[PDB]
Amino acid sequence: MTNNKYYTEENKKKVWKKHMIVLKFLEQPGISEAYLNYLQEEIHNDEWIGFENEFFEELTGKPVINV
Amino acid sequence: MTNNKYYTEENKKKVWKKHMIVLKFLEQPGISEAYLNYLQEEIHNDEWIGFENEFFEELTGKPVINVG
Ligand code: NI
Ligand code: NI
């Protein structure tokens, strides 16, 4: 069974760093409130499956990572 | 700038999912533009030293990840 195309070490590193970039953006004024309102809207979208812990941590201001 | 002590598989999976959540937020009206503005203000900030490639891929709309 071929090795992963998507969830790869290089790609996990790239997402880690790009997530740092976006995270500083989310803390900007105006943007913060909109991210929050978006998160409140999205937890009720059943398009996401298996994402419950992450939505909660995001909604409650929990640290991104543990540690 | 990090020793990668918390760069663990569990945390990588967590950051993966969260970044998917945020990615859908960026596609909303207004937010993509605001994000590009932010990145433009941000390019010459020595806050992102060592982030150059990621920053550039983000600014030029290059894919989030590399399929191959
Ligand atoms: Ni609901
Ligand atoms: Ni510069």
Residue numbers in the entry:
A (entry chain C): 1 to 67
B (entry chain A): 1 to 68
Reproduce text from the manuscript describing this model.
Here we determined that the arbitrium system in Bacillus subtilis phage phi3T modulates the bacterial toxin–antitoxin system MazE–MazF to regulate the phage life cycle. AimX also inhibits the function of phi3T_93, a protein that promotes lysogeny by binding to MazE and releasing MazF.
We obtained the structure of phi3T_93 alone (wt and its N-terminal His-tagged version; His-phi3T_93) and in complex with AimX. Size exclusion chromatography coupled to multi-angle light scattering (SEC–MALS) analysis confirmed the phi3T_93 dimeric organization in solution.
